[PDB]
């Protein structure tokens, strides 16, 4: 009972300190920057071959190779330039919710409702793709696998916790706890030393991969957070929730900078991605179309559209040349 | 596709696509059903021809040249709103209710109410199974059907009591284009597969009728 009072006063101290740092909103300082106009993006490629809903997609580090997981139980690696299928990996469980690509192109980790993160080796001497390691230890559905190196991966689950794994040994090196709801997404910072995870408790909190410490927590959303992605400089991140609102939080100021809500938007955000410059905030919505937000003025700088069903995944190449979108209509479209 | 190496890469892609289409053909002869219900309600012992295969449990019994795949979602112990949309394309929903449990009956009704009126399952027909007729028949004599349902007013006979429970479950439908196929089952019933088969065939006709434009 006494500690409960201590908990409350600590929140008041944080709120007062957080409010005292606020001097001017982001939309008030950059009011003199000229708008970026209309970003009209045209479909350049249409990747077909999936026979079920597409739930995840990750870009290769060379901005040419893609990976996509679907309910059909197939894992396809695409040549994004010539639309050729490089690999086709049959999964054990057809219920895959996330699917990641290694930064070196050697491995691919891709898992889901089976509570297991399966890692596949592409550069094998036998010419086929084999299941190198199956990571187990999560009691809930898996989401947002992210490779750190060729032998280190961070995973998120519905156990209200995320885990840091060692692919060689197979043991859970570090476990990050503190969430009070299913964790739906995570993103790795460019300096590969920090990451943020968005959970169902309407809170995203910054975690340290080396120490396993919740350095900071961020609030403001009214519903569960569905997606997250860092600003390109690794000093801010953007979240997407079922509240049909996008928000930009700053790690140094510990306060949200601006909101990306529009009166015509009803359905929540599914995916969040940034451009190479950090100016266009692309977000996928449940009303079958993606919107491009000017991340500095909260102005809709065009709409992608085109898809027939809910857009479930977004992806921007490392060089920023194209944007890949996946939806439940079993089609991947590449925009530019 | 100009270079010699790129010509073989295109040949590899076309060979991959052939197997992708072939696997899709073999994935159209199976019926995907969803198992739901409270614990200890017989949701794992409906058909004695199991041929099963913590998390998701599959069951792939076959009947009359048709493949039935049953997905048991129990044991996840997570928020259903985040992964129940994966089963948006299931043919039907199989719900199991235990008539001898007077305490979990209200818990079962909450489960049925949430699932039936879910936004993803607004058109998926439900095959509702009422289990353990004999156990319920003996239980009602010892304790009347009034502690669980204080609003009951009809005769204390088995026929009226069992039908009264059925009416409550169908009172939660509240939607068109959805039909609830009920059936009373016991422990020593072998024709559960036959009951599922005729309901699934009946559900397919309704969806085909809407697609053809007749209705």
């Amino acid at each position, epitope marked *: 009972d006494q500690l409960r009072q201590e908990a409350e006063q600590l929140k008041n101290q944080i709120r007062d300190a957080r409010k005292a740092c606020a001097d001017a909103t982001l939309s008030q300082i950059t009011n003199n920057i000229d708008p970026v106009g209309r970003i009209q993006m045209r479909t350049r490629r249409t990747l077909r071959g999936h026979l079920a809903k597409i739930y995840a997609m990750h870009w290769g580090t060379d901005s040419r190779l893609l990976v996509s997981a679907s309910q059909d139980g197939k894992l396809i690696i695409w040549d994004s330039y010539t639309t050729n299928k*490089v690999h086709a990996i049959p999964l054990r469980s057809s219920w895959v919710m996330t699917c990641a690509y290694a930064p070196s192109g050697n491995y691919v980790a891709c898992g889901g409702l089976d509570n297991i993160c399966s890692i596949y080796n592409l550069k094998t001497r*036998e010419g*086929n793709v084999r299941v190198s390691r199956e990571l187990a230890g999560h009691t809930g559905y898996l989401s947002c696998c992210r490779f750190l190196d060729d032998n280190q991966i961070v995973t998120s689950s519905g156990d209200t916790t995320c885990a840091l794994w060692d692919i060689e040994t197979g043991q859970q090196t570090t476990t990050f706890t503190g969430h009070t709801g299913d964790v739906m997404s995570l993103s790795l910072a460019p300096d590969t030393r920090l990451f943020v995870s968005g959970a169902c408790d309407a809170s995203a909190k910054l975690w340290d991969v080396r120490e396993g410490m919740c350095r900071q927590t961020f609030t403001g959303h009214e519903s569960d957070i569905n997606a997250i992605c860092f600003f390109p400089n690794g000093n801010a991140f953007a979240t997407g929730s079922d509240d049909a609102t996008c928000r930009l939080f700053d790690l140094r100021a510990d306060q949200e900078l601006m909101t990306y809500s529009h009166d015509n938007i009803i359905c929540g955000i599914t995916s969040v991605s940034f451009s190479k410059s950090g100016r266009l905030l692309l977000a996928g919505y449940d009303d079958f179309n993606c919107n491009v937000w000017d991340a500095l003025k909260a102005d809709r700088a065009g709409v992608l559209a085109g898809h027939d069903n809910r857009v479930s995944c977004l992806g921007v190449t490392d060089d920023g040349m194209a944007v890949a979108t996946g939806s439940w209509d079993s089609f991947l479209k590449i925009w530019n | 596709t100009l*270079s010699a190496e790129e010509r*073989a890469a295109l040949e*590899r892609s076309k060979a991959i696509e052939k197997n992708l289409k072939e696997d899709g053909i073999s994935a159209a002869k199976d019926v995907k059903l969803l198992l739901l219900g409270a614990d200890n309600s017989g949701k794992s012992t409906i058909v004695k021809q199991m041929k099963i295969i913590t998390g998701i449990v599959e069951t792939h019994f076959t009947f009359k040249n048709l493949h039935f795949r049953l997905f048991d979602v129990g044991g996840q112990r997570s928020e259903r709103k985040k992964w129940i949309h994966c089963f948006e394309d299931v043919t039907a929903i199989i719900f199991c209710v235990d008539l001898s449990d007077y305490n979990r009956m209200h818990e079962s009704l909450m489960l049925f109410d949430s699932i039936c009126n879910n936004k993803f399952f607004i058109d998926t027909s439900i095959i509702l199974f009422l289990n353990k007729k004999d156990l319920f028949g003996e239980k009602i004599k010892k304790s009347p059907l009034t502690i669980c349902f204080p609003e009951y007013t009809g005769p204390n006979t088995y026929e009226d009591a069992a039908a009264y429970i059925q009416a409550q479950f169908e009172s939660k439908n509240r939607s068109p284009n959805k039909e609830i196929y009920c059936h009373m089952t016991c422990a020593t019933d072998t024709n559960n597969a036959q009951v599922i088969f005729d309901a699934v065939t009946d559900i397919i006709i309704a969806n085909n009728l809407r697609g053809c434009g007749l209705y």
Partner: single-chain antibody, 233 residues
Framework: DVQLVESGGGLVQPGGSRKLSCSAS????????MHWVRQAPEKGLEWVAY????????YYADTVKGRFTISRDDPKNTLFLQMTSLRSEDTAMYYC??????????????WGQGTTLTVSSSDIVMTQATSSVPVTPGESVSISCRSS???????????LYWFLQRPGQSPQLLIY???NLASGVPDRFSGSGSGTAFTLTISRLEAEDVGVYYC?????????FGAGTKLEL
């Protein structure tokens, strides 16, 4: 362990027919394209025929076009080469090579052990400057060969392959496009080039690097090898 073994060699009379079998054990044979390469006595390597994965696309060399035939038995993991009429030119050590083609693949990594066949009594021309180069260990060696056309495709890839045939062994792939090191080769090897002139450099040469070096083009069929540069110590 990847292993290709060939059998069916021997002494045959002119005008007869022989069949060579290449049984594979250690890799997914059904996904690889298999070539036949023959090496005449102390003359050099020469491409013969190629069958694609799934027996879809089949090619033959102009020398033995319409005379040889290639067949593929995927369930048995065996590759055949039936020769109808044999002259005195057919005598050579026939090798069996696997090849897989996709974005970023290595289509000439593994060569078979080779079988010896003895018989009793337009195209891209690649030329190697020299035939014998004496050198001592620790000295960098540069090997260069030219070509008729420009192997640099419009896609940005240059189709040049460098092989090393140690004495008494089978050729081993070192560089497969212009500078892409093969799997398991030492990092001291490096390659470069510009369109029609290419160079292979070996820094900090070791005693086991001696042998005959061949440069081959894969821009267009038929495949043509170089004259062959021999390193002496």
């Amino acid at each position: 362990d990847v292993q290709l073994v060939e059998s069916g060699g021997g002494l045959v009379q002119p005008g007869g027919s022989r069949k060579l079998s290449c049984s594979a054990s250690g890799f997914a044979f059904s996904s690889f394209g298999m070539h036949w390469v023959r090496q005449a006595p102390e003359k050099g390597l020469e491409w013969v025929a190629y069958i694609s994965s799934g027996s879809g696309t089949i090619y033959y060399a102009d020398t033995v076009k319409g005379r040889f035939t290639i067949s593929r038995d995927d369930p048995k993991n065996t590759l055949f080469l039936q020769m109808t009429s044999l002259r005195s030119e057919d005598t050579a050590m026939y090798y069996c090579v696997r090849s897989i083609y996709y974005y970023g693949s290595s289509p000439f990594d593994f060569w078979g052990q080779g079988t010896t066949l003895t018989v009793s009594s337009s195209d891209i021309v690649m030329t190697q400057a020299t035939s014998s180069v004496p050198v001592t260990p620790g000295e960098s060696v540069s090997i260069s060969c030219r070509s008729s056309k420009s192997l640099l495709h419009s896609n940005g890839n240059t189709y040049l392959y460098w092989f090393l045939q140690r004495p008494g062994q089978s050729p081993q792939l070192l560089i497969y496009r212009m500078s892409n090191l093969a799997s398991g080769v030492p990092d001291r090897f490096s390659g470069s080039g510009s369109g029609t002139a290419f160079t292979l450099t070996i820094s900090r040469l070791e005693a086991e690097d001696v042998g005959v070096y061949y440069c081959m083009q894969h821009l267009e069929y038929p495949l043509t090898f170089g004259a062959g540069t021999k390193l002496e110590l």
